[PDB]
Scaffold this active site. Structure first.
Site, mmCIF file in Angstrom:
data_model
loop_
_atom_site.group_PDB
_atom_site.id
_atom_site.type_symbol
_atom_site.label_atom_id
_atom_site.label_comp_id
_atom_site.label_asym_id
_atom_site.label_seq_id
_atom_site.Cartn_x
_atom_site.Cartn_y
_atom_site.Cartn_z
ATOM 1 N N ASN A 1 0.806 -1.213 0.000
ATOM 2 C CA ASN A 1 0.000 0.000 0.000
ATOM 3 C C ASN A 1 0.845 1.271 0.000
ATOM 4 O O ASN A 1 1.873 1.337 0.650
ATOM 5 C CB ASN A 1 -0.927 -0.013 1.221
ATOM 6 C CG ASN A 1 -1.925 1.128 1.226
ATOM 7 O OD1 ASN A 1 -2.138 1.761 2.249
ATOM 8 N ND2 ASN A 1 -2.553 1.382 0.089
ATOM 9 N N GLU B 1 -3.247 6.651 -4.806
ATOM 10 C CA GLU B 1 -3.084 5.568 -3.850
ATOM 11 C C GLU B 1 -3.052 4.262 -4.617
ATOM 12 O O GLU B 1 -3.768 4.091 -5.588
ATOM 13 C CB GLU B 1 -4.212 5.534 -2.806
ATOM 14 C CG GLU B 1 -4.221 4.243 -1.996
ATOM 15 C CD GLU B 1 -4.982 4.325 -0.681
ATOM 16 O OE1 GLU B 1 -5.524 5.391 -0.355
ATOM 17 O OE2 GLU B 1 -5.027 3.305 0.028
ATOM 18 N N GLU C 1 -9.681 9.664 8.600
ATOM 19 C CA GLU C 1 -8.988 9.601 7.329
ATOM 20 C C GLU C 1 -10.105 9.813 6.317
ATOM 21 O O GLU C 1 -11.082 9.080 6.327
ATOM 22 C CB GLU C 1 -8.336 8.239 7.122
ATOM 23 C CG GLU C 1 -7.551 8.114 5.828
ATOM 24 C CD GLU C 1 -7.008 6.717 5.603
ATOM 25 O OE1 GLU C 1 -7.765 5.752 5.794
ATOM 26 O OE2 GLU C 1 -5.828 6.587 5.240
ATOM 27 N N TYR D 1 -7.181 13.452 -0.448
ATOM 28 C CA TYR D 1 -6.939 12.627 0.718
ATOM 29 C C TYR D 1 -6.437 13.466 1.875
ATOM 30 O O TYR D 1 -5.575 14.303 1.699
ATOM 31 C CB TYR D 1 -5.894 11.581 0.317
ATOM 32 C CG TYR D 1 -5.406 10.673 1.409
ATOM 33 C CD1 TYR D 1 -6.151 9.584 1.812
ATOM 34 C CD2 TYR D 1 -4.178 10.882 2.009
ATOM 35 C CE1 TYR D 1 -5.700 8.743 2.803
ATOM 36 C CE2 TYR D 1 -3.721 10.046 3.001
ATOM 37 C CZ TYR D 1 -4.486 8.976 3.392
ATOM 38 O OH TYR D 1 -4.041 8.139 4.376
ATOM 39 N N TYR E 1 -11.538 10.721 2.169
ATOM 40 C CA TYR E 1 -11.303 10.599 0.749
ATOM 41 C C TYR E 1 -12.401 11.224 -0.095
ATOM 42 O O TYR E 1 -13.572 11.106 0.219
ATOM 43 C CB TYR E 1 -11.356 9.119 0.361
ATOM 44 C CG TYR E 1 -10.226 8.217 0.785
ATOM 45 C CD1 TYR E 1 -10.231 7.595 2.021
ATOM 46 C CD2 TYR E 1 -9.192 7.928 -0.083
ATOM 47 C CE1 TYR E 1 -9.214 6.742 2.393
ATOM 48 C CE2 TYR E 1 -8.171 7.081 0.280
ATOM 49 C CZ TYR E 1 -8.187 6.492 1.518
ATOM 50 O OH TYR E 1 -7.174 5.650 1.872
#
Length: 192
Positions: free
Chosen positions: A46, A179, A87, A78, A89
């Site tokens: 990742n 990502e 977190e 992000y 997005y």
């Protein structure tokens, strides 16, 4: 002038904040002129990174470029907040996997000429800005149709999220990121 990074790093380049992170694998993250960055990845688990701001918040983000995923990868605004730890997005494009697999659907929001599906999902044993092995909530806005380039009015998303009980804390970084997850590919993005 800019250098290409192969190890995790954050900083400021040509006036823009940048964050480059990966748990393992090969990623070449190049700091191009202005708000531009390029990336190429492979043999990874990742990784996520891009150029933007720190701190983030309500802003009309403008971005353009190319996104060439070869498998699972996202093109998305992000960012993070603390207290609470979140977190978030705002995904405009994706590869073989549309996140987050329909999990935790909350509704929709119209912004910047498109319609986004909203999701809220919890993470465990995951890295976060405050350390490793953390647990936290993820807030998602995922475009119903893929797009590579345009404006992202963050306030529109933050407001819809708040209306659904998805509250944000103190803003940390906010970048137009690429990502990747167990895939390979490339990206060339300019933020403003």
């Amino acid at each position: 002038s800019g250098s290409c990074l192969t190890n995790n790093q954050t900083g400021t380049h040509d006036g823009y904040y940048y964050s480059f992170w990966k748990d393992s694998g090969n990623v070449t993250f190049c700091l191009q002129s202005g708000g531009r960055y390029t990336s190429q990845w492979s043999n990874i688990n990742n990784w996520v990174g891009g150029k933007g701001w720190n701190p983030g918040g309500r802003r009309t983000v403008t971005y353009s470029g190319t996104f060439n995923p070869n498998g699972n990868a996202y093109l998305t605004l992000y960012g993070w907040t603390t207290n609470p730890l979140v977190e978030y997005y705002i995904v405009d494009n994706w590869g073989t996997y549309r996140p987050p697999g329909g999990q935790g659907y909350m509704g929709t929001v119209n912004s910047d000429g498109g319609t986004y599906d909203i999701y809220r999902t919890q993470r465990v044993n995951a890295p976060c800005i405050t350390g490793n092995n953390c647990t936290f909530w993820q807030y998602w806005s995922v475009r119903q149709q893929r797009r590579t380039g345009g404006t992202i009015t963050t306030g529109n998303h933050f407001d819809a999220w708040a209306s659904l009980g998805m509250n944000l804390g103190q803003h940390n970084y906010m970048v137009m990121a690429t990502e990747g997850y167990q895939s390979s590919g490339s990206s060339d993005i300019t933020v403003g």
